[PDB]
Amino acid sequence: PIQQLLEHFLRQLQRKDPHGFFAFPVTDAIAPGYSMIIKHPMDFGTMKDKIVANEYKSVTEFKADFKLMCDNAMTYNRPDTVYYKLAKKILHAGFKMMSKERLLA
Amino acid sequence: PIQQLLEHFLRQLQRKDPHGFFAFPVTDAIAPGYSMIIKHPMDFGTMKDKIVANEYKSVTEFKADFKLMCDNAMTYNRPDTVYYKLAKKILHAGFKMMSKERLLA
Ligand SMILES: COc1cc(-c2cc(C(C)=O)n3ccccc23)cc(OC)c1Cn1ccnc1
Ligand SMILES: COc1cc(-c2cc(C(C)=O)n3ccccc23)cc(OC)c1Cn1ccnc1
């Protein structure tokens, strides 16, 4: 169904994150106080399961989570950091990838 | 190409580092003061080129670089950190992989 289209989009984005910083949830162990600051955590790992269980109706629900993942990254980490810089790149990239016009292909 | 047992050893270790923390040089941007503390930096990226140019004579030359990479990691980073813990895992793994007895094969 539309699950297949999301898996195409997901694999496009996972490839843009070669070091897998967005691969499973961030822990307080590696990110002090992450759980207190980000109350809506999101990751490709979580977005994979939600395609496996067809819990995505629209594209717009998928990109909502995708944006939440990048906003979390740009909210917890300083602009100086690898996690911030990669978040902004991936956010702007995915939005042009899953856009109104490019969806017509 | 007689020396490809190094490439066997290398790809065993690279796979133990899925996030690719040992894949190219650490920068002071990512690691404050790295250049001051570690004067002999080493990485799989550097070790790949040195197989491409067959600059490794013995196994013991390869393990020497391998050890330097892990000892750098266990010198610069605190025990608490993911880079330290992965260094000690890879160190104990490579030592059993490239050991006195297993070198018979
Ligand atoms: C998805 O797995 C990881 C994520 C991050 C990571 C990701 C992020 C983000 C997305 O904010 N982050 C923020 C501060 C500190 C670390 C991180 C950093 C990581 O290693 C430095 C890893 C890989 N990891 C986790 C546990 N062992 C390895
Ligand atoms: C090979 O690329 C990386 C290496 C490390 C990393 C590796 C190490 C080591 C092994 O000491 N290290 C020590 C302190 C802080 C970071 C690191 C951490 C990384 O991201 C958090 C990255 C990935 N990276 C670098 C620039 N863009 C992505």
SS3 A41: coil
Distance of residue A19 Cα from the nearest chain B Cα, in angstroms: 4
| Residue B46 belongs to some domain of the structure | yes
- CATH number of the domain enclosing B76: 1.20.920.10
Say how many Å lie between the CA of residue B82 and the centre of ligand 1.
Answer: 9
The answer to the question of residue B29 being in a domain is no
| Eight-state DSSP code of residue B18 | T
Going by C-beta distance under 8 Å and a sequence separation of 6 or more, which residues neighbour residue A10?
A44, A47, A48, A51
Helix (H) or strand (E) holding B46: helix B44-52
- Identify the domain containing residue A39 by its residue range: 3-104
How far apart CA B41 and CA B43 sit, in angstroms, is 7
DSSP 8-state code for residue A96: H
Answer for the pair B104, B5: CB distance below 8 angstroms, yes or no. Answer: no
Largest CA distance in chain B: 43
Of A22, A26, A48, A51, which is closest to residue A37 (Cα–Cα)? A26
Q: At what angle do helices B5-14 and B82-97 cross, to 10 degrees?
A: 150
Q: Is residue B96 part of a domain?
A: yes
Would you call B104 helix, strand, or coil by DSSP? Answer: helix
How many independent structural domains does chain A possess? 1
Is residue B12 one of the residues assigned to a domain?
A: yes
Would B30 be classed as within a structural domain?
no
Task: Please enumerate in sequence order all residues whose Cβ is within 8 A of that of B88, keeping only pairs 6 or more positions apart, or say none.
Answer: B70, B74
Residues after which chain B has a gap (C–N > 2.5 Å):
none
C-beta of B29 in contact with ligand 2 (< 6 A)? no
* Residues whose CB is less than 8 angstroms from the CB of residue B90 and which lie 6 or more positions away in sequence, other chains included: B13, B16, B17, B22, B70
Going by alpha carbons, the residue nearest to atom 4 of ligand 2 is: B21
- The answer to whether position B31 is within a domain reads no
Copy the structure tokens of residue A94: 């995915």
In eight-state DSSP terms, residue A39 is S
Residues A22, A44 contacting (CB under 8 angstroms): yes
What whole-number distance in Å separates Cα of residue B22 and Cα of residue B11?
Answer: 12
Locate A73 and state its tokens.
Answer: 């990254």
| Test mutation, A14, A19, A21, A83, chain B, max B CBs within 10 A | A19
The span from the CA of B55 to the CA of B47, in Å, is 9
